[PDB]
């Protein structure tokens, strides 16, 4: 969130989750941002297909 109630990010590269808690996606998909601060710098938490997980936000671009 940070400066709003809704956060959307578009993926530009494919990311495969190494851990069961890690998120997985391909390039070209809108992801919902839940928390920009998960307790680790550079890690973002989002939801995709009812699943929540952390991951380096470099595989997606935030509209704002």
Curated annotation (Swiss-Prot):
Domain of life: Eukaryota
Null allele phenotype: Death at 6 to 7 weeks of age from renal failure. Mice show defects in epithelial foot processes, accompanied by mesangial cell hyperplasia and extracellular matrix deposition.
Subcellular location: Cytoplasm, Cytoskeleton; Cell projection, Ruffle; Cell junction
Post-translational modification: Phosphorylated on tyrosine residues; probably by c-Abl, Fyn and c-Src.
Tissues and organs where the protein is expressed, per its UniProt entry: Expressed in podocytes (at protein level).
Residue ranges occupied by any SH3 domain in the UniProt entry: 5-64
N-terminal signal peptide: none
Domain comment, as recorded: Potential homodimerization is mediated by the coiled coil domain.
General function of this protein: Seems to act as an adapter protein between membrane proteins and the actin cytoskeleton. In collaboration with CBLC, modulates the rate of RET turnover and may act as regulatory checkpoint that limits the potency of GDNF on neuronal survival. Controls CBLC function, converting it from an inhibitor to a promoter of RET degradation. May play a role in receptor clustering and cytoskeletal polarity in the junction between T-cell and antigen-presenting cell. May anchor the podocyte slit diaphragm to the actin cytoskeleton in renal glomerolus. Also required for cytokinesis.
Subunit structure: Homodimer. Interacts with F-actin, PKD2, NPHS1 and NPHS2. Interacts with WTIP. Interacts with DDN; interaction is direct. Interacts (via SH3 2 domain) with CBL (via phosphorylated C-terminus). Interacts with BCAR1/p130Cas (via SH3 domain). Interacts with MVB12A and ARHGAP17. Interacts with ANLN, CD2 and CBLB. Interacts with PDCD6IP and TSG101. Interacts with RIN3. Interacts directly with RET (inactive) and CBLC; upon RET activation by GDNF suggested to dissociate from RET as CBLC:CD2AP complex. Interacts with CGNL1 and SH3BP1; probably part of a complex at cell junctions.
Protein name: CD2-associated protein
Organism of origin: Mus musculus (Mouse)
Residues of the whole record sequence present: 270 to 329 of 637
């Amino acid at each position: 969130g940070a400066m709003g109630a809704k956060e959307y990010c578009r993926t530009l590269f494919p990311y495969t989750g190494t851990n069961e808690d890690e998120l997985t996606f391909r390039e070209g998909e809108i992801i919902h941002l839940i928390s920009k601060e998960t307790g680790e710098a550079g890690w973002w938490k989002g939801e995709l297909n009812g699943k929540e997980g952390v991951f380096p936000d470099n595989f997606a671009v935030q509209i704002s």
